[PDB]
């Protein structure tokens, strides 16, 4: 999406 990555990715 320009999807955000999770804190631990």
């Amino acid at each position: 999406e320009l999807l955000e990555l999770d804190k631990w990715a």
Partner: antibody, heavy 123, light 108 residues
Framework: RITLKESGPPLVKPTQTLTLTCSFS??????????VGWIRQPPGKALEWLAI???????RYSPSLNTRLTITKDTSKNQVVLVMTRVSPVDTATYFC???????????????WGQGITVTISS | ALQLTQSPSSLSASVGDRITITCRAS??????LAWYRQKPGSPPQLLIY???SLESGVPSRFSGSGSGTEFTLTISTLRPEDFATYYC?????????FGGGTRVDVRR
Amino acid sequence: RITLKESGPPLVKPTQTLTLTCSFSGFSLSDFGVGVGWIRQPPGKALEWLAIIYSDDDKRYSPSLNTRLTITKDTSKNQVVLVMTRVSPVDTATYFCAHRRGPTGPVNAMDVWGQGITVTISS
Amino acid sequence: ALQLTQSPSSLSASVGDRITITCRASQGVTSALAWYRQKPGSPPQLLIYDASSLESGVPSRFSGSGSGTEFTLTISTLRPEDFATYYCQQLHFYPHTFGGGTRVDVRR
């Protein structure tokens, strides 16, 4: 071990604001990477992700509910708080807070859930 | 957002049955997928984390495999206490989506 518990009003009026608290023990929002999230479940529906807050005050919300939610933490009281504004009857659901492990694989899941609290929106 | 599709959505079985269940992600979420069993009146319970790892305390009958976009949960011999609803959650992208759930009831 780890145990969490949600509290607040089981009955709230449309438009009014809903404030919920997650009181936990067995861990502290001081342990690097630890997270505490909020998940809600409408009666007969599936789980819905609401928001997450970690040890650094790192925060994330549901894009769809983003201007209606505010999540905070008090490390003295070991509590996390969720504020949901202008609620309507579609917010009637059971709200769960949960624990997320921090970097030691095992952070990929919410490992301990509270038993949840049933909130009903009626005027 | 990232949609997680669970299949089947509902399924009927009998004790001692072998069942497998799936969760499809519209985008690769690596191994960042968790499985939960939720009995009525009770909250979600972690069975599998990081897509393939059995959570401590959980019966060995439960197993999980998958990666990227395809994931499955298998119950080698289902027990009476396994008649509940199962969900998958991905924690790779924000927000952390949950699937619609698979309801497992008793066949008659």
